[PDB]
């Protein structure tokens, strides 16, 4: 005999429409058995639940069993397999036999792809035989049904493609347990928090809003993370307390973690009372930062410490970027009300080392959004079918988790191989790319940024609006801008700051014909010359006469360095015309 | 029944931040079981440890078990697999069943990619079934938990990409046991030396400083190497002693190793007392020279006997080179204090046979740093995707072990194919190179030196500061210089 379990039904939420459908299909045959028998009409036999792992498929099934109050027969993937070649089949028969005999019941087949995979992919004589046993059982149920037999077969799988087309046909009802929304996440948070004593400053609504691509399992973890964060106060208390009971002077310490461990080891049988504390909104934010979106395996490149203060000038470009990327992410309400669709992509083009790569990162940082950087040819393989599959995978990963900025550095390689017929591999990749951009998959949150040092040979098809339409030019030819850059670089030093010197340096003719990379080099060159002066002077004095070291940099060092250094980029005509 | 083991907790060091996090996550559920039960709140279930081989993953787990004092259940990669198709699954069940029954315990899954790899890469019906068994077990634990069941599942892997995305989702906490620093290495050295009687001339701080890309296992070996080097004195003593007891005249010798062997063979049952000697700093340096950086099977080329005395004149160039390369390697303190970022690269250009290749090696030697020399087109393949992957690999190898000088001889081939549209393969390679030089990551310690006999046709993009900005001209037209060379 197998009686039902006691699981909480108030734990699952965000599945309003799907749960309603399930209720309709399962309630009538199980609850009103006398009515169905009298009528003589036939009902639903098999219900298949699909979707990603940890979506609450197993829990939903368990919950449904407990709520209705029917007998639960759990059939896990390897629970029926035996030692000898015959025991496995005998068990399957016994399961179905006992199940039909006793009613009303719910048979749950958890993880079915391990038992019944495609019969062409299974070269074993046992696996094919097991699929056959299941089919036979299904038929027996159908025949027995008009008497008073009431059994519904529930099943859960992670992938529908791996299942044998034969069993798919046998199963009639299908429920898709996919991804949550803002409202749904809010509901899930409430379900988990239910047993906890939340403080008044906690707004679950705010948490849900600022939680993009997280699933039911992820939210569950965020709650657990908060619990651990709160109990850090108790750890500190115990540490101080321990160092008073058993001092051990300075013999127990070589480092910090090790000393803590040793004290606890000494105590052992010492029981301590823990006070029940409440959680803050700050603790939740800390917990959120330390959590993975379960899709960390993707290629999650973390956002650097680059802000707008690191970029000298380009104020016009900054505003334009804010409009396009920060506008839709931070203010979705504004965009929906006016009537326009959110952006797709921008192109950064111009001379080398002007801050194109920096800008991409800076924008990503500002938006507090995710960042992925694919440079030049980090996609291509030696095989005939992996490059295209990989590109498809990238977009799939991006679609799953949004907001994210997808950055493509140096597009001069992939794009020009269209206008002239050369390679076949290059042709396929670019065509797949065009398809991914414009085809059907561009449901926003994902903003594509492209950068190239050479805007010349590029296919107009990629440039077309909807793909990469916003062409932003990054160049450098003005005095005011140069002063800002010099200040920005010399800002990151730590007495003597000297502002007047910086302005004069900028005024010079040699400085006029420079770039961002050149100014950086000038700064480094000046530093090196200064070091030479410090070394020669200090060594002479110390040996003949130990004194102090002076890291100060004057104008004489700057002037000498300035005289020697020459520019990198010569002709700007190439970039501007083409 | 399976009781805990006695391993030293004072052996692992350099993992300050990570160990702290682990402590927070594991201490509360295991130690204060009564408190968690009363509250009703849920805790951490799975802790995954990742990083390279020999990083101390197995040791850390063993240490944690011993320190806490909980029951340790070691599950190695092939320990659960049986003969018949059913025994494997039955064992997995029994493991989880006994584990939940007895508490508090620590289940350790060592090398998990062998058990649960990607289900698409496994065409066997047994492997997929095993993954399913694990999943079922995980769920059972979660259900039983509110009663008084306290079990934490620890796991260790060498590669996260090989693991099935499904099990990755099941596991919640992840700790990265990566590469150590100067301070960290110092600490590791101290842990190993703990049982040895070190001399006063030994400065573990100096060893750590001059130990670039070595791991916890490598340092362990350096210590072992020193032990063998010291006991050479005892070997010499025994040899002299043996030749006096059993002379055998000149019949026992054809060569030197063979004669030594024969004498020892004759003795057999002769027990000798060994004096406990102390190790010197010189013995450590000798030991260090004979050790491999674990990544020996690489493009790692040894530094030749070329010094500044082999190069006639070019005193100005010598000084400039010293500033750029030796400055950051030997004096990091100076650079951090002043405020400038360490160098990236230099270009040696001019007439053939003027010492460009020599200079590169000479600098590497002087700095006592590593040297890799890639000449001309030793990168390109026949396939559409191995050339770019290889370049990426080179930079990855360089990043792992620093200080190193990366030398590119004859760049006149790769660089000019940008200004004029010719090939597609050449285009991809050069673009990847530009990316590796200027892009995301790529920290210092790695100084790139380029050399060319032809400075003419080269793309200005490569010349730009941050990539290969310091253009050094190597020529020869003066009398004084010639006398020095002669
Ligand atoms: N939608 C959800 N709402 C609330 N909690 C959830 C949800 N999904 C998962 N959880 C939490 O995560 C756990 C895992 O759920 P469950 O095992 O049912 O997922 P699953 O989709 O069946 O995973 P798998 O199919 O891989 O076994 C549950 O015990 C529950 O506490
Ligand atoms: N406006 C700027 N502010 C700060 N640093 C800059 C600026 N412009 C250029 N740089 C320096 O140049 C380097 C390259 O910047 P970035 O990669 O963004 O330029 P780019 O236009 O993409 O050209 P490339 O990557 O081809 O050199 C950076 O490491 C940075 O220090
Ligand atoms: N961080 C470290 N500190 C001190 N000793 C170490 C460290 N890492 C490794 N060792 C030494 O090397 C040995 C190997 O450690 P361990 O087997 O735990 O590494 P691992 O990363 O688990 O390797 P694998 O995962 O390939 O089994 C240890 O017994 C220890 O003596
Ligand atoms: N200043 C020098 N001192 C000693 N040997 C030199 C010097 N200049 C050239 N040589 C000799 O020339 C050979 C080549 O030197 P190196 O390869 O460094 O010159 P290069 O400028 O790289 O030109 P290439 O490699 O194209 O001949 C060496 O084997 C060396 O013996």
Numbering used by the authors:
A (entry chain C): 193 to 686, 712 to 762, 768 to 800
B (entry chain D): 193 to 678
Describing publication, verbatim:
To determine the full-length structure, we utilized single particle cryo-EM to obtain an electron scattering map of a Chaetomium thermophilum Rix7 double Walker B mutant (CT Rix7E303Q/E602Q) and derived a structural model of the hexamer. The EM data were classified and refined without imposing symmetry which resulted in one dominant conformation at 4.5 Å resolution, that contained well resolved density for all 12 AAA domains. The electron scattering map revealed that Rix7 adopts an asymmetrical stacked hexameric ring configuration composed of six subunits of Rix7 (referred to as protomers P1-P6). The cryo-EM reconstruction lacks density for the entire NTD of Rix7 (amino acids 1-192), suggesting that this domain is flexible and dynamic. There is sufficient density within the pore to accommodate a ~20 residue unfolded peptide spanning the entire 80 Å length of the pore across the D1 and D2 domains. Five of the six protomers (P1–P5) within both the D1 and D2 domains grip the polypeptide through their pore loops, while P6 does not contact the peptide. The Rix7 cryo-EM structure reveals that even in the absence of the aromatic-hydrophobic-glycine motif, PL-I within the D1 domain of Rix7 (h-S-G, where h is a hydrophobic residue) grips the polypeptide. We defined the P6 protomer as the seam subunit because it does not contact the polypeptide or closely pack with the neighboring AAA domain thereby creating a seam or break in the hexameric ring. In the D1 AAA domain, ATP is present in the nucleotide pockets of all six protomers, whereas only four nucleotides were observed in the nucleotide binding pockets of P1-P4 from the D2 AAA domain. There is no density for ATP in the nucleotide binding pocket of P5 from the D2 domain.
Rix7 is a poorly characterized type II AAA-ATPase that plays an essential role in the assembly of the large ribosomal subunit. Rix7 is a type II AAA-ATPase, composed of a unique NTD followed by tandem well conserved AAA modules known as the D1 and D2 domains respectively. Rix7, the earliest acting ATPase, is proposed to drive release of the essential ribosome assembly factor Nsa1 from nucleolar pre-60S particles. In summary, our work establishes Rix7 as a nucleolar molecular unfoldase that utilizes the D1 and D2 AAA domains to thread substrates through its central pore via a processive hand-over-hand mechanism.
